[PDB]
Design a protein around this nucleic acid. Structure first.
Ligand SMILES: [Mg+2]
Ligand SMILES: [Mg+2]
Lengths: 49, 117, 117
RNA sequence: AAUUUCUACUAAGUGUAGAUCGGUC
RNA sequence: AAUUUCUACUAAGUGUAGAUCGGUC
């Protein structure tokens, strides 16, 4: 170890109005053309940042 | 209550128009999310009511870059259409797909999205 | 032009209403076709403009049989909804999801379709 | 498109693949 | 929900697993 451990608190930037999600149980497309699958589906929320 | 109800009728005409655009945005969102990001059309974007059966090819705001990332609006859950890559932040909510690349595009390309696949 | 345009505007209001019903039928069609036939809601069926925000449970036509076999009706591209099994042949295209068995049921249960699973 | 921050993903289901010492223009 | 006809399916992607002889209230 060494001295100078620094704990940084960080505030919020993205407010609750401009959140965009990948929803639950919806087959969305896939970006990579080298994907052997073509769609994917989860059972919960995948947000944006 | 004469002209006030008249502009209310105009607002209801714009309501049926924006719900036709939202319906075609939903079904068009389904046929676009059916595509694996390579057979996607080059799509005109707008944040204005864009009415694909009454499209005007006049202004130079017409653009033909390939669409993607059509995810929600999770306060109101929408199909959202980034006009470039992931890191361009050009989210919109009104789209009309057309034929091919830029410069005096062809006219409409209505309901031929199943012929893209 | 005094009285005829009045019912023309009423026909446009009914057009906006039936396009709301068609839009909620589209989103509801997707959220029901994303369910594996066991967690399906018990669905009121009709072939009439059914408008779940303006629902009136006064008639004895209320019924809550579990929905199944929801698929495509490509002659006008309409989403078709069977209501029994495959072999009951009672296709409809207007649906309202509620909970449970028959008789003076829960009322509407709109916009809670993600809570089915 | 979910991260200690950055980038390309969904990649076996609130993640996965890499990389990062430093407060200063 | 595709069949020589019927049924349970989607079952590896214009199909899979079975069964069916007679014309006749
Ligand atoms: Mg990223
Ligand atoms: Mg059958």
């Amino acid at each position: 170890l060494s001295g100078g451990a620094e704990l940084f608190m960080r505030r919020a930037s993205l407010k609750k109005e401009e959140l965009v999600v990948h929803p639950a149980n919806s087959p969305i497309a896939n970006k990579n053309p080298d994907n052997p699958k073509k769609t994917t589906t989860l059972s919960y929320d995948v947000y944006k940042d | 209550h004469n002209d006030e109800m008249y502009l209310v009728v105009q607002a209801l005409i714009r309501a049926c128009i924006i719900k036709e655009i939202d319906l075609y945005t939903e079904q068009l969102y389904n046929i676009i999310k059916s595509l694996p990001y390579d057979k996607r059309p080059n799509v005109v974007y707008s944040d204005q009511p864009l009415d694909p059966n009454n499209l005007d090819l006049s202004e130079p705001e017409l653009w033909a870059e390939q669409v993607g990332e059509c995810m929600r609006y999770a306060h109101n859950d929408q199909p959202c259409f980034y006009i470039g890559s992931t890191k361009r932040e050009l989210r919109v909510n009104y789209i009309v797909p057309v034929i091919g690349v830029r410069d005096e595009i062809e006219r409409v390309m209505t309901l031929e999205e199943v012929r893209n696949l």
